[PDB]
Paper text:
As part of the RIKEN Structural Genomics Initiative (RSGI) project, in collaboration with UK Structural Genomics, we selected the hypothetical protein [name] (13 kDa, 113 residues) from Geo­bacillus kaustophilus [name] to predict its function from analysis of its crystal structure. The [name] protein is a member of the [name] family in the Pfam database. In conclusion, the crystal structure of the hypothetical protein [name] revealed two small domains: a helix–turn–helix motif at the N-terminal region and an SH3-like β-barrel structure at the C-­terminal region. Based on structural comparisons, we speculate that the [name] protein may simultaneously interact with two proteins or with a protein and a nucleic acid to exert its unknown function.
The crystal structure of a conserved hypothetical protein, [name], from [name] has been determined to 2.2 Å resolution. The crystal belonged to space group P43212, with unit-cell parameters a = b = 75.69, c = 64.18 Å. The N-terminal region contains a helix–turn–helix motif (α1, Lys14–Met34; α2, Val37–Tyr53). The C-terminal domain possesses a β-­barrel-like structure with four β-strands (β1, Glu64–Ile68; β2, Ala71–Lys82; β3, Phe85–Arg90; β4, Glu98–Pro101). All other results from the search showed that the structural similarity occurred within the distinct domains of either the 44-amino-acid N-­terminal region or the 54-amino-acid C-terminal region. Hence, we speculated from this analysis that the N-­terminal region of [name] may be involved in a protein–protein or a protein–nucleic acid interaction. Since the functional tetramerization and the critical residues for enzymatic function are absent in [name], it is unlikely that [name] possesses an activity similar to that of DHFR. The domain bearing these residues, which are responsible for recognizing the methylated histone tail, is absent in [name]; however, the [name] and MRG15 chromodomain structures both possess similar hydrophobic environments. However, the structural analysis suggested that the β-barrel domain of [name] may also be involved in protein–protein interactions with an unknown function.
Numbering used by the authors: 5 to 108
Write the structure that this text describes.
Amino acid sequence: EQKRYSEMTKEELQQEIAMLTEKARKAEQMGMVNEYAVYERKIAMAKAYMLNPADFHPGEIYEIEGAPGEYFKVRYLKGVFAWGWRLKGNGEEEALPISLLRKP
C-alpha cells in the first residue's frame, strides 16, 4: 500500500514519476487541464525528494523551473520546500518544492 514520497527510495520515486508522467500525458491529450496540473504538482514533489536541499540558500534568488524570466527569492528552507516569494508577483510568502528552482 502507498508509501509517501518522503519514504521512497530513488528507484521508487523514479517509477512513481514515470507513472505520473504517463497519466499527465493522457490528461493533456484529453484536455483535462485541472487533472494535468494535479499530476504535474505530484511530479514536482517526487522530483524534490531526489534533490539536495543544501544546494539552496536563504537570501538567494532563483529562476523558476517551467517559467522563463520569473524568479523566486528564498527566505528559508524546510524539508524539500523553499519558502519565499516570486519577484514579479505579490510579496506574499509561498512554499515551493526545491525541484522548481533552477539549480545554482
